[PDB]
């Protein structure tokens, strides 16, 4: 399942995101099973070069996922509080 730049090359940008997402998802899911789809979607908006790096750097992925979880939680809780 290792991903190369050559695999991404000349493929539609949407499909590059799917390719990256398929590799990121099991890792992100391991970290936060209940948030896996959402956190992966958030991370997939990042530049592909940075995503490829994250796939090779567990600490980098961990840092970015920690950030996404904090951002997602705050967004959801703020929106709920506004309507409560």
């Amino acid at each position: 399942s290792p991903l190369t730049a050559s695999m991404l090359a000349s493929a539609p940008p949407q499909e590059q995101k799917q390719m990256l997402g398929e590799r990121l998802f099991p890792l992100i899911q391991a970290m936060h099973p209940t948030l896996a789809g959402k956190i992966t979607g958030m991370l997939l908006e990042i530049d592909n070069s940075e995503l490829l790096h994250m796939l090779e750097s567990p600490e980098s992925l961990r840092s970015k996922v920690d950030e996404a979880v904090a951002v997602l939680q705050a967004h959801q809780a703020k929106e709920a509080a506004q309507k409560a």
Binding site: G21, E22, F25, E45, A68
Partner: peptide
């Protein structure tokens, strides 16, 4: 700059 309104990623996996 992360977007909490980002679309959910849907893996080509089995669900459930």
């Amino acid at each position: 700059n992360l977007n909490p309104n980002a679309a959910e990623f849907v893996p080509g996996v089995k669900y459930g």
